[PDB]
Design a protein around this motif. Structure first.
Motif, PDB file in Angstrom:
ATOM      1  N   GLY A 104       8.642  -1.346 -36.549  1.00  0.00           N
ATOM      2  CA  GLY A 104       8.781  -1.446 -37.993  1.00  0.00           C
ATOM      3  C   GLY A 104       8.263  -0.207 -38.708  1.00  0.00           C
ATOM      4  O   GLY A 104       8.969   0.349 -39.554  1.00  0.00           O
ATOM      5  N   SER A 105       7.051   0.235 -38.347  1.00  0.00           N
ATOM      6  CA  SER A 105       6.473   1.433 -38.937  1.00  0.00           C
ATOM      7  C   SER A 105       7.378   2.631 -38.694  1.00  0.00           C
ATOM      8  O   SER A 105       7.568   3.469 -39.584  1.00  0.00           O
ATOM      9  N   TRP A 106       7.905   2.718 -37.470  1.00  0.00           N
ATOM     10  CA  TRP A 106       8.784   3.808 -37.060  1.00  0.00           C
ATOM     11  C   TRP A 106      10.088   3.758 -37.834  1.00  0.00           C
ATOM     12  O   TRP A 106      10.565   4.789 -38.304  1.00  0.00           O
TER      13      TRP A 106
ATOM     14  N   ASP B 140       6.008   8.026 -32.519  1.00  0.00           N
ATOM     15  CA  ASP B 140       6.412   6.630 -32.616  1.00  0.00           C
ATOM     16  C   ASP B 140       7.079   6.138 -31.335  1.00  0.00           C
ATOM     17  O   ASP B 140       6.692   5.096 -30.828  1.00  0.00           O
TER      18      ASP B 140
ATOM     19  N   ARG C 175       5.500  -4.276 -34.703  1.00  0.00           N
ATOM     20  CA  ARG C 175       4.807  -3.540 -35.750  1.00  0.00           C
ATOM     21  C   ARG C 175       5.142  -2.061 -35.655  1.00  0.00           C
ATOM     22  O   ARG C 175       5.497  -1.443 -36.656  1.00  0.00           O
ATOM     23  N   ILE C 176       5.019  -1.489 -34.455  1.00  0.00           N
ATOM     24  CA  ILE C 176       5.212  -0.056 -34.258  1.00  0.00           C
ATOM     25  C   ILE C 176       6.654   0.320 -34.515  1.00  0.00           C
ATOM     26  O   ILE C 176       6.919   1.369 -35.096  1.00  0.00           O
TER      27      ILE C 176
ATOM     28  N   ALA D 232      10.449   2.481 -40.722  1.00  0.00           N
ATOM     29  CA  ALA D 232      10.086   2.821 -42.090  1.00  0.00           C
ATOM     30  C   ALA D 232       9.907   4.332 -42.251  1.00  0.00           C
ATOM     31  O   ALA D 232      10.435   4.920 -43.209  1.00  0.00           O
ATOM     32  N   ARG D 233       9.147   4.958 -41.345  1.00  0.00           N
ATOM     33  CA  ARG D 233       8.883   6.382 -41.500  1.00  0.00           C
ATOM     34  C   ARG D 233      10.181   7.183 -41.406  1.00  0.00           C
ATOM     35  O   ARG D 233      10.342   8.198 -42.101  1.00  0.00           O
TER      36      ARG D 233
END
Lengths: 111, 325, 122, 111, 111, 110
Positions: free
Chosen positions: C114-116, C12, C111-112, C118-119
RNA sequence: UGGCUCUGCCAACGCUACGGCUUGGCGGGCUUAGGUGGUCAGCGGUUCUGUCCUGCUUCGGCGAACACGUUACACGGUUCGGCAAAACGUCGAUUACUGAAAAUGGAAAGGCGGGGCCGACUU
RNA sequence: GUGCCCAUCACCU
RNA sequence: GGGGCAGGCUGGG
């Protein structure tokens, strides 16, 4: 060892990159000042790392080395007038890689 | 180029080439673990790769083999796809130059689409009455990797490029790995042997090969059946390729070549293609993905601009509204 | 050969930085355009732009969600800088198109991130 | 604190003249050196109030960074700004403030 | 509450023009004022990514510091002075952001 | 309270800022750092007042202490005289006034 | 990059340790590639409700089930001629040849291509 | 996973 | 009966 070694190996990065980072036109002046603060300020990251052995401190020494490699990429290209000719990025990345190796060994030694 | 080719590992490991290999390897993949782990010390990585290749201490990391539906897709590490790209920048253009014109696979300025056009064209002129279409069983999975290296070796002559080619693709087995740039190249090169049993022997001058598929327009369906028998016997005895499907059809069934069905007159894509597209669109609609559909639509509007689909494009605009053309 | 490893590889962080490098590569040219004047705004924008990489990077290596949120705050501040460089900077600094282009790139990094976030949050 | 800063004032009083001798060329290194030199006083001071050992180790890191700056200004800074003698004399002064910082670290981590 | 940033961005829109005007003479004041003005967005942003009231009070402190900057830039003298009007007609804008920050602090404090 | 300390510190700034702008360019980093310590301690006070951790009220004290350092440092920085000894004395009086208020405030919180 | 720890001058906010400094002018100096999608070689399983197809075969298989004129029924930059010297490709050949050895030298005649060439017309 | 090609996006010649 | 196309109901992703 460890902090002393890493810093002496990182001093070679600084000794290579500081001249490059002093050349970065004043136009790319903020980039330069921030690159110099990343380059000469990674010593502080190493220094803090070997004053705690908190392994998070040697990871933020890695983060700094990572940021320093960002700076190479940026001053290699993203910096228009340029500031780290592609060769300079290559040479610096080798030196930073040597500091990276020592940081990795140090991270492992703490692990 | 005077034949020979006896010093390619010097050009494969030119920093200037490994940097091209690097940029080619990363192109598209700049959101992958491999690029992003390599990108870190890229020119320090490429300096230890350059000098792995320049030593003959390069060793290809194991293929990470998954599969999509039914393939057998073996991935490589970024360093390995870069070595492949650095081979296939010197080594590829000394093989892809011997590839007879009518091989349309993985060679610059010939493609899926320059192939279907070659076929239509060559079907247009010649006024072809008939055609042989053939196909190799499990090609990459049946390429000798051994009589391949008797073609990668009548043209590499450089005994270190040869040993880098043999790391990136071992010289033993019957499995050229599918999912290698190195392997796209060496499969075109190998299947180039059957092109040089069509065009050279057999004096077949109207054909097209796209990797494993081989159209061979004729005029006597008996001659084209001969050609085929000769092609199969060759590619079986010499190249270890079973021919999965073949036919010697009159040019009228349409040459199901490369995505299209190619009559002299209408390269009518393929109905498969329509229904695949129809379904793709319909799915996209009832997936809420009507924005990647514009990308797909624009794609299929290219595969179908040449094929004949005005009415079909009207029809798809009437069914879903979306701007086809 | 095995590429020179950094420690604490955050797919990430690595991805976000490579995608954010595109924001920098887009915005740095137009930051280094903010006129001679607007130089303090530029230096502060450039310190926000080029210094978001450090925010991402430190988020990657110090697996602490605090540093990931600090990276998000910086992306948010970078989005402010787009607003500012467009609107409040008077010559132009940033053409409306440039804000639209930059916001797309920052959105990709958003986006990245956010994904990061989240993970890590799981 | 008070005594550490008064002893560090001697480092600054020795090093600041050296930092002002660094040519324009190496002006960003100088500004960064001066921000390390003159700004270690803030590190000492903030530990003086907020006695938390965290703040005290940051003061130590800063002294260590200032020692790096001596190394850097003597040699890596290409017109080796600081002469080896000056690095020697500066390191003595920094060592004195290092001793006091160490004693202060120790006084705080008594338990 | 992200109307805060969008109501503060008219403070910036008012104050930035007259900050990118504090002559070099007052250039450190300017850089620090601009870092207070343009950098209050970060204070708000951090507050809104946490709704920790600590970060919300830090945003308030920044607005208070920005109000200081107005009063400071007023009596900076010479024709470079932030005119008394502008101090008042920015204090209005900052007050609007202050109101929203206060309501936001309250919304968080009385959960 | 933050308002009082800041208004009394504004007098330090109003005395020192003119003096801190006069510190020669030669001593330019020290000057810009002194100015950033001087205007910039306002933020330390303000953060201390608009919140409360008493750490913020110590960081305000640290800043006043650093400002006192800057006065002593700038007094006799080099041949380009930055700050006259008188100026340090005058400024130290003003900083002492804000020091007193900070101390009382630290105490009132404690 | 509103620089300069950079000077001369002049001001004057100012600060002066009375030197200047600061500050202001004013000179001057120093200062195509990439991203991302989507195809092509190359996601199914089951019953159901419509809907349509159910031909061919050289026995390998090819189809079909409406792109419906399965076709913009009209071609091309998928053009039409002429060539094929060259260059390219390819075989000859990792041969001859050179040299102990082809050893990271190395042909060629020749043979085969069209990929190439030259026009026309169009692009 | 691989290339070739399509679309679109930036971005200057 | 088999088969292609569009929708039923469920994996991959």
């Amino acid at each position: 060892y460890d902090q002393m070694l890493i810093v002496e190996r990182y001093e070679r990065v600084i000794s290579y990159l500081y001249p490059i980072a002093q050349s970065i036109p004043r136009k790319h002046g903020v980039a330069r000042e921030m690159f110099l603060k990343c380059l000469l300020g990674q010593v502080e990251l190493f220094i803090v790392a070997g004053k705690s052995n908190q392994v998070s401190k040697l990871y933020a020494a890695d983060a700094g080395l990572a940021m320093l490699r960002f700076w190479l990429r940026f001053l290699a290209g993203i910096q228009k007038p340029h500031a780290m000719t592609p060769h300079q990025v290559e040479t610096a990345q080798v030196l930073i890689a040597e500091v990276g190796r020592i940081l990795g060994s140090w991270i492992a030694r703490v692990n | 180029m005077g034949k020979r080719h006896r010093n390619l590992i010097d050009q494969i490991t030119t920093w200037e080439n490994l940097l091209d290999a690097y940029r080619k390897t990363s192109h598209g993949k700049r959101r992958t673990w491999g690029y992003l782990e390599f990108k870190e010390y890229d020119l320090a990585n490429l300096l230890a790769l350059q000098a792995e290749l320049k030593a003959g201490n390069y060793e290809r990391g194991p293929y990470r083999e998954f599969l999509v539906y039914p393939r057998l897709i073996s991935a490589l590490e970024f360093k390995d796809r870069l070595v492949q790209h650095a081979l296939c920048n010197i080594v590829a253009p000394i093989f892809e130059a011997g590839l007879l014109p009518y091989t349309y696979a993985c060679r610059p300025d010939k493609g899926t689409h320059a192939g279907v056009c070659h076929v239509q064209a060559e079907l247009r002129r010649t006024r072809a009455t008939h055609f042989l279409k053939s196909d190799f069983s499990k090609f990459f999975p049946s390429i000798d990797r051994a009589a391949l290296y008797a073609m990668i070796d009548k043209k590499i002559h450089c005994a270190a490029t040869r040993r880098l080619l043999r790391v990136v693709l071992p010289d033993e087995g019957v499995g050229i790995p599918i999912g290698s740039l190195t392997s796209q190249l060496f499969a075109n090169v190998y299947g180039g042997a059957v092109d040089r049993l069509l065009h050279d022997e057999l004096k077949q001058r109207h054909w097209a090969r796209y990797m494993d598929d081989i159209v061979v327009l004729g005029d006597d369906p008996e001659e084209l059946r001969a050609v085929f028998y000769r092609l199969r016997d060759f590619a079986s005895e010499r190249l270890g390729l079973k021919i999965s499907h073949w036919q010697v059809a009159p040019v009228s069934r349409g040459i199901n070549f490369l995505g299209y069905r190619i009559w002299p007159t209408h390269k009518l894509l393929r109905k498969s293609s329509v229904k695949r597209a129809k379904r793709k669109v319909a799915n996209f609609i009832k997936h809420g993905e009507d924005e990647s559909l514009q990308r797909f639509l624009a794609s299929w509007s290219g595969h179908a601009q040449w094929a004949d689909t005005h009415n079909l494009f009207t029809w798809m605009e009437e069914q879903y509204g979306i701007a086809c053309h």
